[PDB]
Design a protein around this ligand. Structure first.
Ligand SMILES: C[C@@H](O)c1nc2cnc3[nH]ccc3c2n1[C@H]1CC[C@H](C#N)CC1
Length: 293
């Protein structure tokens, strides 16, 4: 008889499925280690009215990006950047686009608008996001101002999860294997020395991130600039060991200009050499809130 074909089942629309053919690249936002993020417009109507979105893709580790996507897809918190969907055949992660960019872009341009009180409020928000992440048994491993996005003058969000790892149930840390592109000047001693990563290691990084926030992310005051001034900028492959030794002696980043001692002491509690001696995110929140009232 007639050409037998297949009966077509009724098509549903998945709002988390972005078709490659409507995803139009505008410009680069940043580079991770495994990958890069681009500003696109998703423009199915083809008239430049579609929503702007941030698109993470691999540099030509698919497994790692898929893991990152599954982590982010299931995080729900006002201080964590929103997952929007994926674009598949390879895969791309689609996230909300925050036009103000990271604290690295925003702070230098808005010093006059952002005073100590607003800085402490951002600090509380970063801790709340991080505490949420820790409650889900994750270690972030890349907490720095460049990964903290500005939603508005009043709100920030943790905006990248490229290095985030699950801590095994009943275990206390994650053991790192690939460490070549580590942000060593944000890293706690146990991370540097033994490649172990605790929730307390993220508390250490938070301290460094707070330092950046308090210096308005100026490049001449960045943790790297300041540490290389402390240990020497010409040690090449001995840099990390020199860093470890400086930290062993008790040396830390100095108090930022105009930063009250009481804020600097909260920062120093993040940098206890021993993980078990460091403050917690919940204690930091309490400390900041007390300074705000
Ligand atoms: C300008 C740059 O800091 C930036 N602007 C963004 C706006 N919306 C975004 N949504 C997701 C990321 C993202 C953004 N990123 C960076 C943040 C850090 C990321 C990394 N690693 C690269 C893109």
């Amino acid at each position: 008889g007639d050409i037998v074909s297949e009966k077509k089942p009724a098509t549903e629309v998945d709002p988390t499925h972005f078709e490659k053919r409507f995803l139009k690249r505008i410009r680069d936002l940043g580079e991770g280690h495994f990958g890069k993020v681009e500003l696109c417009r998703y423009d199915p109507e083809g008239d430049n009215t579609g929503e702007q979105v941030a698109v993470k893709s691999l540099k030509p580790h698919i497994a790692d990006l898929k893991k990152e996507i599954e982590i982010l897809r299931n995080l729900y918190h006002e201080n964590i950047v929103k997952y929007k969907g994926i674009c598949t055949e390879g895969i791309k992660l689609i996230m909300e686009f925050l036009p103000s960019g990271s604290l690295k872009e925003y702070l230098p341009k808005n010093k006059n608008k952002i005073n100590l009180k607003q800085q402490l409020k951002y600090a509380v928000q970063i801790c709340k996001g991080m505490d949420y992440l820790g409650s889900r048994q994750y270690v972030h491993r890349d907490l720095a101002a460049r990964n903290v996005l500005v939603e508005s003058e009043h709100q920030v969000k943790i905006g990248d999860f490229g290095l985030t790892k699950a801590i095994e149930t009943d275990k206390e840390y994650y053991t790192v294997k690939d460490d070549r592109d580590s942000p060593v000047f944000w890293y706690a001693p146990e991370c540097l020395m033994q490649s172990k990563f605790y929730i307390a290691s993220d508390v250490w990084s938070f301290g460094v991130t707070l330092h950046e926030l308090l210096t308005y992310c100026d490049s001449d005051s960045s943790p790297m600039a300041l540490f290389l001034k402390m240990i020497g900028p010409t040690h090449g492959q001995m840099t990390v060991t020199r860093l470890v030794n400086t930290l062993k002696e008790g040396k830390r980043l100095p108090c930022p200009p105009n930063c009250p001692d009481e804020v600097y002491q909260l920062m120093r509690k993040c940098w206890e050499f021993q993980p078990s001696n460091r403050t917690s995110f919940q204690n930091l929140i309490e400390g900041f809130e007390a300074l705000l009232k």
